[PDB]
Amino acid sequence: SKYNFQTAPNRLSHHTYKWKETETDPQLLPAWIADMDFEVMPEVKQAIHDYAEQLVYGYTYASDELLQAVLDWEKSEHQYSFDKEDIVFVEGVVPAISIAIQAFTKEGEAVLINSPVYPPFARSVRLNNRKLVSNSLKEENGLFQIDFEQLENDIVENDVKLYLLCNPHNPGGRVWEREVLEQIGHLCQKHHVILVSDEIHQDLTLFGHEHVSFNTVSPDFKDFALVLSSATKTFNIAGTKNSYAIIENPTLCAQFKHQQLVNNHHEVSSLGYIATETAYRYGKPWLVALKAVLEENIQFAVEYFAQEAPRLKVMKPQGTYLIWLDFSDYGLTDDALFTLLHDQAKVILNRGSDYGSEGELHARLNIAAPKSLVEEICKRIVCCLPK
């Protein structure tokens, strides 16, 4: 218990998204947006104090030490070896997604996602005036799976140019096996599709599930695929605004960097650089401790819901700290479910329908909070469900 996973810091004065509603209605307990109600690792807090003590807060660049820290993290944690020149810093992963869409496709061309998925995927495609192709995931034995026949159909019928892959997949928390990723890659090679693998949850695979970074699947995958990740989801530092793309293919790397500069989206803040380097240098023990806490919270929620709401269908995450809940067996509409949870149960969960039509009558639950808070949130979710 060296690190504090037992007590949530009070965030009410910090202008957070997560606790905003609670500031007006103190009864509301938020468990929606993916940041954590855990204190950040102490080395990052110290690094922010140390930044203050620089005294001058001018223009800074991404250092060789930061580049090496990213290289070292990827090698040590994900067995992914590349060169410092392959790293492109971006203030966030969602920014990187828009840059990729703009760099690798033209207006009107088709971009494929596996639905239901993180809403900025569909939004970034549509707002960019690209054609969205939603490849609907199957649900079998409590897990999402890809229908590869329909995936190929979706690619061919729509002349898909870009595939935005989520790995681990949010929502659901699906940690794709190497064999699944290999089939995806072969389809991209066949049909000349560029693949962007959003691996922001890569450090949060649980219960023995192992993240397989996309370009580690086959040595040639870097010819068409790039990887996005960050320290921010792993270490709860989203407000520091830094992330990266690993782009080993020279042409793809130049294309991305060019579009990033066209958009004047090439700079990152000083603390963005500092916090990522610090997290990667010092964060491993904290991450190990976090993952044990997350596993306990998830197991608790699954068992509690099984006992108190056996009609509630719970997808057990293989990774991420987010649980996908299916209220389909209840006599509720999508809107009535939202009103029930928010107004009667006083719990704020993400509306599943935000993620696509497959999310109708679902909600997403964030369990990256102390066990006592998770216990209360689960109690509230089961309190008011209709007979």
Ligand X SMILES: Cc1ncc(COP(=O)(O)O)c(CN[C@@H](CO)C(=O)O)c1O
Contacts to ligand X by CB under 6 A: 33-34, 92-94, 118, 166, 170, 198, 200, 230, 232-233, 238, 243
- Cβ-contact 145, 139 below 8 angstroms: yes
59 is in an annotated binding site: yes
d(CA 179, CA 211): 12
Burial of 48 (0-12, 13-18, 19+ CB in 10 A): middle
Q: How far is the CB of 186 from ligand X (least distance, A)?
A: 23
Interacting positions 98-137 with a copy of itself (CB under 8 A): 98-99, 102, 120, 124, 127-128
Contact with a copy of itself (CB under 8 A): which of 3, 21, 22, 33? Answer: 33
- Is 304 one of the annotated binding-site residues? no
Structure tokens at 127: 């707002």
Of 94-102, 131-139, 292-300, 309-317, the segment contacting Na ion by CB under 5 A is 131-139
Collect all residues with Cβ–Cβ distance below 8 Å to 383 and sequence separation of at least 6: 344, 345
Q: Does 342 appear as a known binding residue?
A: no
Whether 170 has a binding-site annotation, put simply, is yes
166 neighbors 356 (Cβ within 8 angstroms): no
- Closer CB to ligand X, residue 259 or residue 309? 259
Q: Which of residues 44-103 bind a copy of itself (CB under 8 A)?
A: 44-46, 48-49, 51-63, 91-92, 94-95, 97-99, 102
| Sequential DSSP letters for 133-194 | EEEEPEEETTEEE--HHHHHHHHHHTTEEEEEEESSBTTTTB---HHHHHHHHHHHHHHT-E
Looking at the DSSP assignment, which residues form a beta bridge with residue 313? 326
Give the whole-angstrom CA distance, residue 368 versus residue 234: 11
* Stretch of 257-265, 321-329, 339-347, 351-359 lying at the interface with a copy of itself (CB under 8 A): 257-265
First to last CA, the chain: 42
Check: CB of residue 83 under 8 Å from CB of residue 222. no
Residue 264 engages a copy of itself in binding (rule: CB under 8 A) = yes
Has 201 been labeled as part of a binding site? yes
Q: How far is the CB of 201 from ligand X (least distance, A)?
A: 6
200 binds, among ligand X, a copy of itself, Na ion, none (CB under 5 to 8 A by kind): ligand X
Alpha-carbon distance of 200 to 37, in angstroms, equals 18
Nearest Cα residue to 6 out of 372, 294, 374: 372
The nearest distance, CB 198 to ligand X, in angstroms, is 5
Residue type for position 154: D
- What part of residues 354-383 is at the interface with a copy of itself (CB under 8 A)? none
Footprint (CB under 5 A) of Na ion, residues 319-358? 356-357
Query: Are the C-beta atoms of residues 231 and 221 closer than 8 Å to each other?
Result: no
Tokens 């947006």 correspond to 33
Q: Which is nearer to ligand X, 33 or 143 (CB)?
A: 33
Q: Which is nearer to ligand X, 198 or 358 (CB)?
A: 198
Main-chain phi, psi angles of 306, to 5 degrees: -60, -40
Q: Write down the residue that tokens 């369990």 correspond to.
A: 367
Q: Which of 30, 172, 272, 283 binds a copy of itself (CB under 8 A)?
A: 272
Residue 75 CB, shortest distance to a copy of itself, in Å, is 23
Q: Residue 120 CB, nearest distance to ligand X (Å)?
A: 7
- Distance of closest approach, residue 211 Cβ to a copy of itself, in angstroms: 23
Build a one-symbol-per-residue string for 3-22: x at contacts with a copy of itself by CB under 8 A, - elsewhere.
------x-x--xxxxx-x--
- The residues, any chain, with a CB within 8 Å of residue 216's CB and separated by 6 or more, are 78, 79, 80
Least Å distance between CB 170 and a copy of itself?
15
When asked if residue 385 is in the footprint of a copy of itself (CB under 8 A), the reply is: no
The contact pattern for a copy of itself, residues 229-248, with x = CB under 8 A and - = no contact, is: -------xxxxxx-------
Alpha carbons within 13 angstroms on the beta-carbon side of residue 375 total 5
Query: Which stretches of the chain bind Na ion, using CB under 5 A?
Result: 134, 356-357
Residues that bind a copy of itself (CB under 8 A): 9, 11, 14-18, 20, 33, 35-40, 44-46, 48-49, 51-63, 91-92, 94-95, 97-99, 102, 120, 124, 127-128, 236-241, 258, 261-265, 267-273, 275
